[PDB]
Amino acid sequence: DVYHDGACPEVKPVDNFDWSQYHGKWWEVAKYPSPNGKYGKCGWAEYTPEGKSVKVSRYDVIHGKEYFMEGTAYPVGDSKIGKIYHSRTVGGYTKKTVFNVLSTDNKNYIIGYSCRYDEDKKGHWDHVWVLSRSMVLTGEAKTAVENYLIGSPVVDSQKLVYSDFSEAACKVNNSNWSHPQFEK
């Protein structure tokens, strides 16, 4: 539950986003546990370059439920500066989402910030997610996430929540046969 007045707050996006490293397969790390709490850390998403823009396809099982959400990343304005809107298509409708990527380290973690405006509430809401090349945030990546958090302008870490899905997450109620495991 994150409510605010006006539109997205003050957040300086990447001066010059580079898909050089920031790409491939990434997995969520510390992303708001949401209200209803809907997530699934058991998917595989890749980033394909499409000339300036980079396609992104996400697919996983959110709380015993096959989920999928893709969207290309394109520069809203200045190619350099962040301001990269993600196109999210649905059924027979398309919406252009603007995602301002504060500042990424392009190592093993990625930060950002997105807030959608509500004409009903007048104000707006916040909606962001944290990515981590590795299922677990480590190395200098931790620093990037640490530094950012430390100087969290709005992103209240105390609110955020680090990875936490558990096989149970993936494991679906009688579906998609899976393989067991073992522990020393």
PDB file of all heavy atoms in Angstrom, residues 2-18:
ATOM      1  N   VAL A   2       0.987   1.862  -1.170  1.00  0.00           N
ATOM      2  CA  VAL A   2       1.794   3.061  -1.318  1.00  0.00           C
ATOM      3  C   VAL A   2       1.006   4.109  -2.103  1.00  0.00           C
ATOM      4  O   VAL A   2       0.830   3.981  -3.314  1.00  0.00           O
ATOM      5  CB  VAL A   2       3.136   2.711  -1.967  1.00  0.00           C
ATOM      6  CG1 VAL A   2       4.132   2.198  -0.926  1.00  0.00           C
ATOM      7  CG2 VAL A   2       2.949   1.696  -3.096  1.00  0.00           C
ATOM      8  N   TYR A   3       0.550   5.124  -1.382  1.00  0.00           N
ATOM      9  CA  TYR A   3      -0.217   6.194  -1.998  1.00  0.00           C
ATOM     10  C   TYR A   3       0.533   7.524  -1.914  1.00  0.00           C
ATOM     11  O   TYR A   3       1.267   7.769  -0.956  1.00  0.00           O
ATOM     12  CB  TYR A   3      -1.512   6.301  -1.191  1.00  0.00           C
ATOM     13  CG  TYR A   3      -2.458   7.402  -1.676  1.00  0.00           C
ATOM     14  CD1 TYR A   3      -2.826   7.459  -3.004  1.00  0.00           C
ATOM     15  CD2 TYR A   3      -2.943   8.337  -0.784  1.00  0.00           C
ATOM     16  CE1 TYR A   3      -3.716   8.496  -3.461  1.00  0.00           C
ATOM     17  CE2 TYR A   3      -3.832   9.373  -1.240  1.00  0.00           C
ATOM     18  CZ  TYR A   3      -4.175   9.402  -2.556  1.00  0.00           C
ATOM     19  OH  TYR A   3      -5.016  10.381  -2.987  1.00  0.00           O
ATOM     20  N   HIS A   4       0.325   8.351  -2.928  1.00  0.00           N
ATOM     21  CA  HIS A   4       0.972   9.650  -2.981  1.00  0.00           C
ATOM     22  C   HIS A   4       0.097  10.628  -3.767  1.00  0.00           C
ATOM     23  O   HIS A   4      -0.887  10.226  -4.387  1.00  0.00           O
ATOM     24  CB  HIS A   4       2.387   9.529  -3.552  1.00  0.00           C
ATOM     25  CG  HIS A   4       3.252   8.516  -2.841  1.00  0.00           C
ATOM     26  ND1 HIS A   4       4.360   8.872  -2.092  1.00  0.00           N
ATOM     27  CD2 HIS A   4       3.160   7.157  -2.770  1.00  0.00           C
ATOM     28  CE1 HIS A   4       4.904   7.768  -1.599  1.00  0.00           C
ATOM     29  NE2 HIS A   4       4.158   6.707  -2.021  1.00  0.00           N
ATOM     30  N   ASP A   5       0.487  11.892  -3.718  1.00  0.00           N
ATOM     31  CA  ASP A   5      -0.250  12.931  -4.418  1.00  0.00           C
ATOM     32  C   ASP A   5       0.523  13.340  -5.674  1.00  0.00           C
ATOM     33  O   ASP A   5       1.753  13.335  -5.680  1.00  0.00           O
ATOM     34  CB  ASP A   5      -0.418  14.173  -3.541  1.00  0.00           C
ATOM     35  CG  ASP A   5      -1.715  14.953  -3.766  1.00  0.00           C
ATOM     36  OD1 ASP A   5      -2.769  14.437  -3.336  1.00  0.00           O
ATOM     37  OD2 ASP A   5      -1.624  16.046  -4.363  1.00  0.00           O
ATOM     38  N   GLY A   6      -0.231  13.686  -6.708  1.00  0.00           N
ATOM     39  CA  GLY A   6       0.368  14.097  -7.965  1.00  0.00           C
ATOM     40  C   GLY A   6       0.807  12.883  -8.787  1.00  0.00           C
ATOM     41  O   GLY A   6       0.107  11.872  -8.829  1.00  0.00           O
ATOM     42  N   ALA A   7       1.963  13.023  -9.418  1.00  0.00           N
ATOM     43  CA  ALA A   7       2.504  11.950 -10.235  1.00  0.00           C
ATOM     44  C   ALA A   7       3.773  11.404  -9.579  1.00  0.00           C
ATOM     45  O   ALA A   7       4.071  11.728  -8.430  1.00  0.00           O
ATOM     46  CB  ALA A   7       2.756  12.466 -11.654  1.00  0.00           C
ATOM     47  N   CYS A   8       4.488  10.586 -10.337  1.00  0.00           N
ATOM     48  CA  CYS A   8       5.719   9.993  -9.842  1.00  0.00           C
ATOM     49  C   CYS A   8       6.533  11.085  -9.147  1.00  0.00           C
ATOM     50  O   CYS A   8       6.528  12.237  -9.576  1.00  0.00           O
ATOM     51  CB  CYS A   8       6.511   9.316 -10.964  1.00  0.00           C
ATOM     52  SG  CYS A   8       6.993   7.584 -10.626  1.00  0.00           S
ATOM     53  N   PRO A   9       7.233  10.673  -8.055  1.00  0.00           N
ATOM     54  CA  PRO A   9       8.050  11.603  -7.296  1.00  0.00           C
ATOM     55  C   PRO A   9       9.344  11.933  -8.043  1.00  0.00           C
ATOM     56  O   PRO A   9       9.503  11.568  -9.207  1.00  0.00           O
ATOM     57  CB  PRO A   9       8.293  10.915  -5.962  1.00  0.00           C
ATOM     58  CG  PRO A   9       8.000   9.442  -6.194  1.00  0.00           C
ATOM     59  CD  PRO A   9       7.263   9.316  -7.517  1.00  0.00           C
ATOM     60  N   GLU A  10      10.235  12.620  -7.344  1.00  0.00           N
ATOM     61  CA  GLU A  10      11.511  13.003  -7.926  1.00  0.00           C
ATOM     62  C   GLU A  10      12.482  11.821  -7.900  1.00  0.00           C
ATOM     63  O   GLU A  10      12.852  11.341  -6.830  1.00  0.00           O
ATOM     64  CB  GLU A  10      12.101  14.215  -7.205  1.00  0.00           C
ATOM     65  CG  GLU A  10      11.665  15.519  -7.876  1.00  0.00           C
ATOM     66  CD  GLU A  10      11.867  16.712  -6.939  1.00  0.00           C
ATOM     67  OE1 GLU A  10      11.020  16.872  -6.033  1.00  0.00           O
ATOM     68  OE2 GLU A  10      12.864  17.437  -7.149  1.00  0.00           O
ATOM     69  N   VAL A  11      12.868  11.386  -9.091  1.00  0.00           N
ATOM     70  CA  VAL A  11      13.790  10.271  -9.217  1.00  0.00           C
ATOM     71  C   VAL A  11      14.632  10.452 -10.481  1.00  0.00           C
ATOM     72  O   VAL A  11      14.113  10.370 -11.594  1.00  0.00           O
ATOM     73  CB  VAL A  11      13.018   8.950  -9.197  1.00  0.00           C
ATOM     74  CG1 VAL A  11      12.609   8.576  -7.771  1.00  0.00           C
ATOM     75  CG2 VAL A  11      11.798   9.013 -10.119  1.00  0.00           C
ATOM     76  N   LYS A  12      15.917  10.694 -10.269  1.00  0.00           N
ATOM     77  CA  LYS A  12      16.836  10.887 -11.378  1.00  0.00           C
ATOM     78  C   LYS A  12      17.145   9.534 -12.020  1.00  0.00           C
ATOM     79  O   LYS A  12      17.769   8.674 -11.398  1.00  0.00           O
ATOM     80  CB  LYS A  12      18.080  11.647 -10.916  1.00  0.00           C
ATOM     81  CG  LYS A  12      18.413  12.791 -11.875  1.00  0.00           C
ATOM     82  CD  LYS A  12      18.231  14.148 -11.194  1.00  0.00           C
ATOM     83  CE  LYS A  12      17.936  15.243 -12.222  1.00  0.00           C
ATOM     84  NZ  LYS A  12      18.711  16.466 -11.913  1.00  0.00           N
ATOM     85  N   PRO A  13      16.683   9.380 -13.290  1.00  0.00           N
ATOM     86  CA  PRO A  13      16.903   8.146 -14.024  1.00  0.00           C
ATOM     87  C   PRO A  13      18.352   8.044 -14.502  1.00  0.00           C
ATOM     88  O   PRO A  13      19.115   9.002 -14.390  1.00  0.00           O
ATOM     89  CB  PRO A  13      15.901   8.183 -15.165  1.00  0.00           C
ATOM     90  CG  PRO A  13      15.479   9.636 -15.304  1.00  0.00           C
ATOM     91  CD  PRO A  13      15.940  10.375 -14.058  1.00  0.00           C
ATOM     92  N   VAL A  14      18.687   6.874 -15.026  1.00  0.00           N
ATOM     93  CA  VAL A  14      20.032   6.635 -15.523  1.00  0.00           C
ATOM     94  C   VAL A  14      20.398   7.721 -16.535  1.00  0.00           C
ATOM     95  O   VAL A  14      19.596   8.063 -17.402  1.00  0.00           O
ATOM     96  CB  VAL A  14      20.133   5.221 -16.100  1.00  0.00           C
ATOM     97  CG1 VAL A  14      20.140   4.173 -14.986  1.00  0.00           C
ATOM     98  CG2 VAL A  14      19.003   4.954 -17.097  1.00  0.00           C
ATOM     99  N   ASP A  15      21.612   8.235 -16.392  1.00  0.00           N
ATOM    100  CA  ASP A  15      22.095   9.275 -17.284  1.00  0.00           C
ATOM    101  C   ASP A  15      22.232   8.706 -18.697  1.00  0.00           C
ATOM    102  O   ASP A  15      21.882   9.370 -19.673  1.00  0.00           O
ATOM    103  CB  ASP A  15      23.469   9.784 -16.843  1.00  0.00           C
ATOM    104  CG  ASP A  15      24.600   8.759 -16.940  1.00  0.00           C
ATOM    105  OD1 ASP A  15      24.583   7.817 -16.117  1.00  0.00           O
ATOM    106  OD2 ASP A  15      25.454   8.938 -17.833  1.00  0.00           O
ATOM    107  N   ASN A  16      22.741   7.486 -18.762  1.00  0.00           N
ATOM    108  CA  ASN A  16      22.928   6.821 -20.041  1.00  0.00           C
ATOM    109  C   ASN A  16      22.834   5.307 -19.842  1.00  0.00           C
ATOM    110  O   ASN A  16      23.832   4.651 -19.550  1.00  0.00           O
ATOM    111  CB  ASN A  16      24.306   7.135 -20.628  1.00  0.00           C
ATOM    112  CG  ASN A  16      25.416   6.827 -19.620  1.00  0.00           C
ATOM    113  OD1 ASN A  16      25.175   6.589 -18.448  1.00  0.00           O
ATOM    114  ND2 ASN A  16      26.639   6.843 -20.141  1.00  0.00           N
ATOM    115  N   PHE A  17      21.623   4.795 -20.007  1.00  0.00           N
ATOM    116  CA  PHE A  17      21.383   3.371 -19.850  1.00  0.00           C
ATOM    117  C   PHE A  17      22.098   2.571 -20.942  1.00  0.00           C
ATOM    118  O   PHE A  17      22.033   2.925 -22.118  1.00  0.00           O
ATOM    119  CB  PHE A  17      19.874   3.153 -19.979  1.00  0.00           C
ATOM    120  CG  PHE A  17      19.293   2.192 -18.940  1.00  0.00           C
ATOM    121  CD1 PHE A  17      17.968   2.236 -18.639  1.00  0.00           C
ATOM    122  CD2 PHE A  17      20.103   1.294 -18.317  1.00  0.00           C
ATOM    123  CE1 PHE A  17      17.429   1.343 -17.675  1.00  0.00           C
ATOM    124  CE2 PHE A  17      19.564   0.401 -17.353  1.00  0.00           C
ATOM    125  CZ  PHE A  17      18.238   0.445 -17.053  1.00  0.00           C
ATOM    126  N   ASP A  18      22.761   1.508 -20.514  1.00  0.00           N
ATOM    127  CA  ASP A  18      23.486   0.654 -21.440  1.00  0.00           C
ATOM    128  C   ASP A  18      23.033  -0.795 -21.254  1.00  0.00           C
ATOM    129  O   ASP A  18      23.085  -1.328 -20.146  1.00  0.00           O
ATOM    130  CB  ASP A  18      24.993   0.716 -21.182  1.00  0.00           C
ATOM    131  CG  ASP A  18      25.852   0.968 -22.422  1.00  0.00           C
ATOM    132  OD1 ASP A  18      25.651   0.229 -23.411  1.00  0.00           O
ATOM    133  OD2 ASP A  18      26.690   1.893 -22.354  1.00  0.00           O
TER     134      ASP A  18
END
